[PDB]
Amino acid sequence: PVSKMRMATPLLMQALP
Amino acid sequence: MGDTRPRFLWQLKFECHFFNGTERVRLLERCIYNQEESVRFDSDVGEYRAVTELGRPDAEYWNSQKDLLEQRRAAVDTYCRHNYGVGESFTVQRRVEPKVTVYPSKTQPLQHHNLLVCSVSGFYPGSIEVRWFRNGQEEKAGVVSTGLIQNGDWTFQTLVMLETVPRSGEVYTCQVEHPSVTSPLTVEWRA
Amino acid sequence: MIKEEHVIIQAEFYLNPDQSGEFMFDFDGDEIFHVDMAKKETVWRLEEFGRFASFEAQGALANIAVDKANLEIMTKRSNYTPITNVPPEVTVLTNSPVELREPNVLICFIDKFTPPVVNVTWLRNGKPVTTGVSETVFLPREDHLFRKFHYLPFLPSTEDVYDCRVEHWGLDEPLLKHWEFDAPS
């Protein structure tokens, strides 16, 4: 039984226009 | 090399810091543009903070998103402590016994052996103590360490030199303590 | 003494115009795993780690895609300011004490550099060698520069000389780091 390593997810920056 | 076009780099780091097992846990998310950290989330602070002016709009923009913030504020549990639990047995708790050897060496090309080196290698974790004896008596002065060298493969090594010109009848001892062993490893050498 | 602090770092990067990305986990300076971007697979630093944990590689590819999109925004915001080249320091050592004719590994340790693009060549007696070589991905540093290891298995001899040749945009000429048997310490 293998444990799952979790990832954290980066947040998107606000679109420029 | 070749291709000197300008480069643009973005790095993201999620640092889970653990103290005394998991008694204290801290998440630090760091955003880095060209070696310049611009914005971060520190779980001890609880919101994004701008590190440079370049990062301010991100700080403001992400702090404005209440559900993203609540996710990050829970990350010390749902991410840091979770992953500590997944890897602990093969990382925090990893033990590999050192190999110990003694060999003579020289400080300068040409001149004769004026060092004994005690090489300690293949070991994990980094915690190690090395002591030198001449005829069972501890040698304190003239002892020099490289300290800890990480081999990149989950082993360390270190070299501990004793300045001495060995004479017959001397037996030198390298003694090594490390978590992987309940008694010190010793290796003897004589000229 | 019992070590008090441990740190696990998920470290990612994207670099333009190369379009190279990397995703990896670091524990106290050793790589736990990285995701191979071309093969789209989780590669554990020691085979045996994958007997104990798993990691879905497709999630790392999704992160690198966000990282790509942010890099581009940041590149405009900074009005196209490029990274300054920082050339590596290089050290060559063996992983164990060198005995004549007993198999060993040369380690080329490439440190304190950025951007993460480097060419490393092992030279035996001035001629390239590739047999058995291996390397790590780029490993993180607290100052945001990079570390990397290349490895050359070898059979020590009184006659052979070795050079790790390292090339990088921040170096005027290739950096040649020499090793031979019986060097003074």
- Catalogue all structural domains in chain C, each as residue range(s) with its CATH number: 1-82 (3.10.320.10), 83-185 (2.60.40.10)
> Residue type for B120, please?
V
Same structural domain for residues B63 and B9?
A: yes
How many Cβ atoms sit within 10 Å of the Cβ of residue C48?
9
* Apex B53 CA angle, B52 and B57, nearest 5: 115
How many Cβ atoms sit within 10 Å of the Cβ of residue B71?
15
Nearest CA in chain C to A17: C73
Contact residues, chain B, for C107 at CB < 8 Å: 151-152
Same structural domain for residues B101 and B142?
A: yes
Residues C119/B40, Cβ–Cβ less than 8 Å:
no
Is the N-terminal amide bond of B98 cis, ω within 30° of 0? no
Q: Which of A11, A12, A16 to mutate to test the interface with B (most CBs of B within 10 A)?
A: A11
Q: Could you list the beta-strand ranges (E) of C50-145.
A: 53-54, 89-94, 104-113, 119-124, 127-129, 134-135, 139-140
Q: A5 exposed, middle or buried (CB, 10 Å; 0-12, 13-18, 19+)?
A: buried
> Which of B57, B78, B83 is opposite residue A14, by nearest beta carbon?
B57
Is the N-terminal amide bond of B125 cis, ω within 30° of 0? yes
How many Cβ atoms sit within 10 Å of the Cβ of residue B19?
13
Angle, helices B56-63 vs B66-75, to 10°: value is 100
Tell whether A5 lies on the interface with B, counting CB pairs under 8 A: yes
For residue C85, give the DSSP letter: P
Same structural domain for residues B42 and B61?
A: yes
Q: C13 exposed, middle or buried (CB, 10 Å; 0-12, 13-18, 19+)?
A: buried
Same structural domain for residues B71 and B113?
A: no
| Both structure tokens of C158 | 């009184």
Distance (Å, rounded) from C-alpha C97 to C-alpha B121?
Answer: 8
| Both structure tokens of C27 | 């524990």
Which residue matches tokens 């040698």?
Answer: B139
> Residue type for B83, please?
N
| Both structure tokens of B20 | 């005394």
Same structural domain for residues B142 and B114?
A: yes
> Residue type for C73, please?
I
Same structural domain for residues B99 and B184?
A: yes
Residues C53/C45, Cβ–Cβ less than 8 Å:
no
Q: Which residues, including other chains, have CB under 8 Å from residue C104's CB and lie 6 or more apart?
A: C94, C95, C96, C98, C153, C154, C155, C156
Q: Which residues, including other chains, have CB under 8 Å from residue C174's CB and lie 6 or more apart?
A: C165, C166, C167
Residue that is last in its domain, among B64, B93, B122: B93
Distance (Å, rounded) from C-alpha B49 to C-alpha B39?
Answer: 6
* Gap from A15 CA to chain B (nearest CA, Å): 11
Q: Which residues, including other chains, have CB under 8 Å from residue C156's CB and lie 6 or more apart?
A: C94, C98, C99, C100, C101, C102, C104, C181
Tell whether C67 lies on the interface with A, counting CB pairs under 8 A: yes
Beta partners for B31? B12, B39
Residues B126/C3, Cβ–Cβ less than 8 Å:
yes
Q: Write out the H or E segment, with its range, that includes residue C27.
A: strand C20-27
Same structural domain for residues B138 and B172?
A: yes
Chains contacting A (3+ CB pairs below 8 angstroms):
B, C
Tell whether C74 lies on the interface with B, counting CB pairs under 8 A: yes
Contact residues, chain C, for B126 at CB < 8 Å: 3
Laid out side by side, the sheet with C161-167 consists of C127-129, C119-124, C161-167, C175-180
Same structural domain for residues B102 and B153?
A: yes
> Residue type for B172, please?
Y
Residue that is last in its domain, among B39, B71, B93: B93
In 3D space, the residue among C173, C169, C160, C170 whose CA is nearest the CA of residue C123 turns out to be C160
- Is there a binding annotation on residue B153? no
> Residue type for C174, please?
P
Distance (Å, rounded) from C-alpha C98 to C-alpha C182?
Answer: 8
Which residue matches tokens 């019986």?
Answer: C182
Q: How far is CA B99 from CA B148, B152, C9, C27, in A?
A: 14, 17, 29, 23
Q: C110 exposed, middle or buried (CB, 10 Å; 0-12, 13-18, 19+)?
A: buried
Residues C166/C119, Cβ–Cβ less than 8 Å:
yes
- Domain with B133 in it: 94-191
CATH of the domain at B124: 2.60.40.10
Backbone φ and ψ of B186, nearest 5° = -130, 145
Q: C159 exposed, middle or buried (CB, 10 Å; 0-12, 13-18, 19+)?
A: exposed
Q: Which residues, including other chains, have CB under 8 Å from residue B33's CB and lie 6 or more apart?
A: B8, B9, B10, B54, C71, C74, C78
- Is there a binding annotation on residue B17? no
Q: Could you list the beta-strand ranges (E) of B72-114.
A: 99-105
How many Cβ atoms sit within 10 Å of the Cβ of residue B2?
6
Same structural domain for residues B1 and B83?
A: yes
Number of domains chain B is built from: 2
Same structural domain for residues B23 and B74?
A: yes
Residues B6/C82, Cβ–Cβ less than 8 Å:
yes
Q: Which residues, including other chains, have CB under 8 Å from residue B70's CB and lie 6 or more apart?
A: none
In 3D space, the residue among B32, B33, B36, B62 whose CA is nearest the CA of residue B49 turns out to be B62
For chain B, how long is the longest CA-to-CA vector? Answer: 77
Laid out side by side, the sheet with B24-33 consists of B48-50, B36-42, B24-33, B8-19, C5-16, C20-27, C30-36, C41-44
Distance (Å, rounded) from C-alpha C75 to C-alpha C72?
Answer: 5
Residue that is last in its domain, among B78, B93, B108: B93
Same structural domain for residues B51 and B135?
A: no
| Both structure tokens of B133 | 């004896």
- Is there a binding annotation on residue B82? yes
CATH of the domain at B44: 3.10.320.10
DSSP three-state, residue B94: coil
Tell whether B29 lies on the interface with A, counting CB pairs under 8 A: yes
Same structural domain for residues B190 and B135?
A: yes
